[PDB]
Write a protein that binds this ligand. Structure first.
Ligand SMILES: Cc1cc2nc3c(=O)[nH]c(=O)nc-3n(C[C@H](O)[C@H](O)[C@H](O)CO)c2cc1C
Ligand SMILES: Cc1cc2nc3c(=O)[nH]c(=O)nc-3n(C[C@H](O)[C@H](O)[C@H](O)CO)c2cc1C
Lengths: 120, 120
């Protein structure tokens, strides 16, 4: 039996590229990605599960935006940032990335949810 | 935002004493317990979250049944066992305990679900 992680998605997130990471595992890997995420980024499931989502960054991604996300994660707060991201074929898009922390009933950080939206 | 862990319950488990543990944390602690669990066992939420469910065992609990559960957990398989358990007031009941593993999309063990049923 597999956890239905999507049961923890918000209504906005249902048609989207959305992912969950597990910060209690080494390197905060993605443990779930939606099919829209895989379609927009050009990857298969095998290529992305268990990896940190850093692989969407590329040669012209701003390193301060990357550090901003890292700090935002440490803060355990809701945040949104526009960051240049790339697909497997190397094509680039501005990603409006929204991240929020999700807690267990004890109030311990359990997952991060991330939603990607290409800015048009 | 708190994960709705009960979204991962089976239909049988809805009216029951049911709990989830996190085996990736030290001592495989309960991260969720239903109100029926707290009512049947005589505890408050603060008294049980973050603890291993071993505290339901007591003076006449059979140590081989305890080891059977431990091995069943290591096996990552569905199992049921009748074990003598106790409430906070020291009263005892035969618990028909059913445990199953729950996996993430990668196929890694994520949680155990446990359902308690007093045998009448
Ligand atoms: C749930 C979640 C989703 C993320 N999604 C993206 C993303 O879409 N693009 C990106 O560049 N970084 C993303 N990151 C950031 C990346 O995984 C890493 O945290 C940063 O590179 C800072 O170390 C995400 C992080 C988390 C926790
Ligand atoms: C999800 C879950 C529920 C459990 N529920 C009970 C229980 O109701 N009574 C009990 O004696 N042990 C229970 N245990 C067993 C206990 O926590 C521990 O695993 C055993 O004592 C073997 O170490 C449970 C274990 C898990 C993982």
């Amino acid at each position: 039996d597999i956890a239905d992680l999507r049961a923890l998605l918000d209504e906005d997130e249902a048609e989207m590229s959305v992912v969950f990471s597990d910060p209690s595992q080494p390197d905060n890997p993605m443990i779930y990605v939606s099919d829209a995420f895989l379609v927009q980024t050009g990857y298969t499931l095998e290529e992305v599960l268990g990896r940190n989502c850093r692989f969407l960054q590329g040669p012209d991604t701003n390193p301060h935006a990357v550090e901003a996300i890292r700090q935002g994660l440490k803060a355990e707060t809701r945040f949104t940032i526009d960051i240049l991201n790339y697909r497997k074929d190397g094509s680039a898009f501005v990603n409006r990335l929204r991240i929020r922390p999700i807690y267990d009933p004890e109030g311990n950080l359990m997952f991060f949810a991330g939603a990607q939206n290409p800015v048009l």
